[PDB]
Amino acid sequence: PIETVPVKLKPGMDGPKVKQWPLTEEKIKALVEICTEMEKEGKISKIGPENPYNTPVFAIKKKDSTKWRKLVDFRELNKRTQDFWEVQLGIPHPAGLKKKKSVTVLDVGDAYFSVPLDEDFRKYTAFTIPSINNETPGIRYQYNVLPQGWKGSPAIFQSSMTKILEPFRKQNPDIVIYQYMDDLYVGSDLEIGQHRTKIEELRQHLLRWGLTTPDKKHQKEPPFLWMGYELHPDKWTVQPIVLPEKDSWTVNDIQKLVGKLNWASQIYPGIKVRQLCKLLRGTKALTEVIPLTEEAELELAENREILKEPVHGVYYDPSKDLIAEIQKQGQGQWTYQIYQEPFKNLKTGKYARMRGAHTNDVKQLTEAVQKITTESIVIWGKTPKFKLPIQKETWETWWTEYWQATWIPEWEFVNTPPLVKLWYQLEKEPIVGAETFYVDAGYVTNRGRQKVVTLTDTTNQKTELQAIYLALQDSGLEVNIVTDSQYALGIIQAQPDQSESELVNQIIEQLIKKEKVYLAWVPAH
Partner 1 sequence: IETVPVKLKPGMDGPKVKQWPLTEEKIKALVEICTEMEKEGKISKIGPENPYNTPVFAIKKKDSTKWRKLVDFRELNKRTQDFWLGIPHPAGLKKKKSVTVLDVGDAYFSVPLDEDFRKYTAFTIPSINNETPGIRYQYNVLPQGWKGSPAIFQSSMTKILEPFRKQNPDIVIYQYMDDLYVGSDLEIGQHRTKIEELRQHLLRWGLTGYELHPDKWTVQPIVLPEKDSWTVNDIQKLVGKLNWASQIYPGIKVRQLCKLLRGTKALTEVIPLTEEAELELAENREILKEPVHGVYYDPSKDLIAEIQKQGQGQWTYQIYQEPFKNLKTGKYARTNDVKQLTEAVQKITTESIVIWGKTPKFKLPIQKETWETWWTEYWQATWIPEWEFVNTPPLVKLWYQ
Give binding residues for Mg(2+) as ranges: 107, 182-183, 440, 464, 484
First to last CA, the chain: 83
Which distant-in-sequence residues (6+ apart) come within 8 Å of 271 by Cβ? Answer: 261, 262, 264, 265, 303, 306, 350
Minimal distance in Å, beta carbon 439 to partner 1? Answer: 11
How far, in Å, CA of 224 to CA of 146, rounded?
A: 29
Residues in contact with ligand NVP, shown as a per-residue x/- string from 163 to 182 under the rule CB under 6 A: -------------x-x----
**Under the criterion CB under 6 A, does residue 411 sit at the interface with ligand NVP?**
no
Tell me which amino acid residue 524 is. A
User: Given strand 436-439, what is the order of strands in its sheet?
Assistant: 450-452, 442-445, 436-439, 478-483, 516-521
Which distant-in-sequence residues (6+ apart) come within 8 Å of 248 by Cβ? Answer: 289
Q: How far is CA 500 from CA 287, 330, 506, in A?
A: 29, 15, 11
Looking at residues 259 to 318 of the shown chain, list those that interact with partner 1 (rule: CB under 8 A).
none
Minimal distance in Å, beta carbon 426 to Mg ion? Answer: 18
Give the residue at shortest CB distance from Mg ion. 440
**Under the criterion CB under 6 A, does residue 226 sit at the interface with ligand NVP?**
yes
Which distant-in-sequence residues (6+ apart) come within 8 Å of 485 by Cβ? Answer: 439, 461, 464, 465, 467, 468, 521
What is Dmax (Cα atoms) for the chain?
Answer: 109
How far, in Å, CA of 117 to CA of 373, rounded?
A: 43
Length of the chain: 525
Alpha helices in 172-212 (DSSP H): 192-207
440 binds, among Mg ion, ligand NVP, partner 1, none (CB under 5 to 8 A by kind): Mg ion
Minimal distance in Å, beta carbon 359 to partner 1? Answer: 13
20 binds, among partner 1, Mg ion, ligand NVP, none (CB under 5 to 8 A by kind): none
382 binds, among ligand NVP, partner 1, Mg ion, none (CB under 5 to 8 A by kind): partner 1
**Under the criterion CB under 6 A, does residue 316 sit at the interface with ligand NVP?**
no
Query: At CA 426, angle to CA 482 and CA 480, rounded to 5?
Result: 30
Residue choice 38, 231, 279, 488 for contact with ligand NVP (CB under 6 A): 231
User: Residue 297: what are its φ and ψ, rounded to 5°?
Assistant: -80, -20
Minimal distance in Å, beta carbon 367 to Mg ion? Answer: 35
- Closer CB to ligand NVP, 185 or 438, in the complex: 185
Residue choice 56, 92, 210, 270 for contact with partner 1 (CB under 8 A): 92
**Under the criterion CB under 6 A, does residue 224 sit at the interface with ligand NVP?**
yes
Looking at residues 151 to 180 of the shown chain, list those that interact with partner 1 (rule: CB under 8 A).
152, 155-156, 158-159, 162, 178
- Closer CB to partner 1, 343 or 407, in the complex: 407
- Closer CB to ligand NVP, 378 or 455, in the complex: 378
Minimal distance in Å, beta carbon 133 to partner 1? Answer: 43
Q: Half-sphere exposure of 266 toward its Cβ, with a 13 Å CA cutoff?
A: 18
DSSP class of 32: H
Minimal distance in Å, beta carbon 95 to Mg ion? Answer: 56
Q: Which residues pair with 483 in a beta bridge?
A: 521
Residue choice 378, 453, 455, 477 for contact with partner 1 (CB under 8 A): 378
In 3D, which of 43, 5, 67 has the Cα closest to residue 147? Answer: 43
Residue choice 167, 259, 381, 418 for contact with partner 1 (CB under 8 A): 381
**Under the criterion CB under 5 A, does residue 440 sit at the interface with Mg ion?**
yes
Tell me which amino acid residue 347 is. K
Looking at residues 56 to 95 of the shown chain, list those that interact with ligand NVP (rule: CB under 6 A).
92
**Under the criterion CB under 8 A, does residue 12 sit at the interface with partner 1?**
no
Pairing of strands 436-439, 478-483: parallel
**Under the criterion CB under 6 A, does residue 97 sit at the interface with ligand NVP?**
yes
Task: Give strand ranges (E) for 331-393.
Answer: 333-341, 344-351, 358-359, 385-388
How far, in Å, CA of 323 to CA of 357, rounded?
A: 31
Detail the residues annotated as belonging to a binding site.
107, 182-183, 440, 464, 484
Alpha helices in 41-84 (DSSP H): 75-80
Helix 486-493 / helix 460-474 crossing angle, nearest 10 deg: 60
**Under the criterion CB under 6 A, does residue 511 sit at the interface with ligand NVP?**
no
**Under the criterion CB under 6 A, does residue 122 sit at the interface with ligand NVP?**
no
**Under the criterion CB under 8 A, does residue 482 sit at the interface with partner 1?**
yes
Minimal distance in Å, beta carbon 188 to ligand NVP? Answer: 8
How far, in Å, CA of 444 to CA of 452, rounded?
A: 9
How far, in Å, CA of 506 to CA of 402, rounded?
A: 23
**Under the criterion CB under 5 A, does residue 474 sit at the interface with Mg ion?**
no
224 binds, among Mg ion, ligand NVP, partner 1, none (CB under 5 to 8 A by kind): ligand NVP
Give the range of 96-104, 142-150, 165-173, 407-415 binding ligand NVP by CB under 6 A. Answer: 96-104
Residue choice 262, 374, 416, 473 for contact with partner 1 (CB under 8 A): 374
Minimal distance in Å, beta carbon 325 to ligand NVP? Answer: 25
- Closer CB to partner 1, 47 or 488, in the complex: 488
How far, in Å, CA of 511 to CA of 395, rounded?
A: 20
Find the helix or strand (DSSP H, E) in which 180 lies: strand 176-180
Tell me which amino acid residue 450 is. Q
Enumerate binding residues for ligand NVP (CB under 6 A). 92, 97, 100, 103, 176, 178, 185, 187, 224, 226, 231, 233
Residue ranges binding partner 1 (CB under 8 A): 5-8, 82-85, 88, 90-93, 96-97, 152, 155-156, 158-159, 162, 178, 355, 367, 370-371, 373-374, 377-383, 399-407, 429-433, 435-436, 438, 444-446, 480, 482, 486, 489-490, 493, 518, 520-523
